[PDB]
Amino acid sequence: KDQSVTLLSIIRDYLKLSDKEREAARILANGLVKVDGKTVREKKFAVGFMDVIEINGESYRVVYNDQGALVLMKETKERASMKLLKVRSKVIAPGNRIQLGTHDGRTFITDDKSIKVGDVLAVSVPDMKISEIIKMQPGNKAYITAGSHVNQTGTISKIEAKEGSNLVHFQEGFSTIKDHVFMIGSSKFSFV
Template identity: 40%
Template sequence: MAIMGSRKHLKRFKSPEHWPIHPKEFTWTVKPSPGPHAIEGSLPLLVIVRDILQIADNAREARIIINNGEVLVDGRVRKDYKFPVGFMDVIQLPKAGKAYRVLPDEQGRLVLHPIEEGNTEFKLCRVQDKVTIKGGKTQLNFHDGRNCLTDGDYKTGDVIVLNIPDQEIKDSIKFEDGTIGLITGGKHIGEKGTVKQINITRSSMPNTVVIETDGNSFQTLKDYVFVLGKDKPMISLPGGN
């Protein structure tokens, strides 16, 4: 039993701090499947249905709801109750007429931020890197593990607006001075502000960005900045825009 538990489940006291479960209530919780998001930055679908949305009283009821195809992630039905849901994913409950975007709050916890049904047709994806493949096409690799081919001129750090679920590029947000950025890591996680200066180093030191917010400014790593728009965010955020 211990071997089976270690493969299929995760001990609660070892679960990430942002999971909304009591570490001592039971011994085990569900272990996420391998997928687009690492365990440190994701929530299993069962935890979302049972513990966050509370539309199921227990794990069995949550599995039934998920297996019936009542939950969509990025426009696709997901029937794996262990599927890892992470930053910027769009969750829809068509029967209930509700939709959410997964975002960090200022404590670094992943939260389900309610969105209007009309905002479920697109997703923001940060370009992590890009490669040239056979035929001269450029493949963009995104923060959520997906990728797409493009002829466009995009750089690492730019954010692509993807239609979902077909993954067609609808628009883009350049990583540049004056854009609005959401901080996704470090002590300023969950805060947003204006990109004032991008510092590119020519050494092993990481690139940094100066962010201005409410008259104050701070420096953070470039990799922690997720741009959301030029003059205002394209999406609503926890606590308002």
């Protein structure tokens, strides 16, 4: 499935559920839509997993359904002030000058060489402050973003890595490739 969709499409899909899709374009146009706490009126603006979408003062989270498509779910005001960003890419230069590229296209610059692709940053939406790192490692909990176990959660039991052509295993009795595993909880912090 598409890993990003237009802001207009995801709002229209949601509004379909109450037979109000006809108003999607007017609601967007009225400056009544925010993404990650910033007003957006551009219908072509792409949104993806974990984005916080506000429609008319009400908060929603972009998540996946059991078919793997991006959809909105109702979110509490309290949780809406937070977002998890998966580290999707790194550029490592000399002297621990490290660019972290997150799954929503943001970049942060760190000198912590311990942060790996697959680790997750818990950030505050009102100001982008990073508050926690959720490590991709055994004993931590994840949500599955693609493949056959999409929209399931589990606690990692073991991780296997090789060079050339892998797998994260879960206590719950399944495994997937790392690409599909999105960290959401540790002992000290949980999205849930």
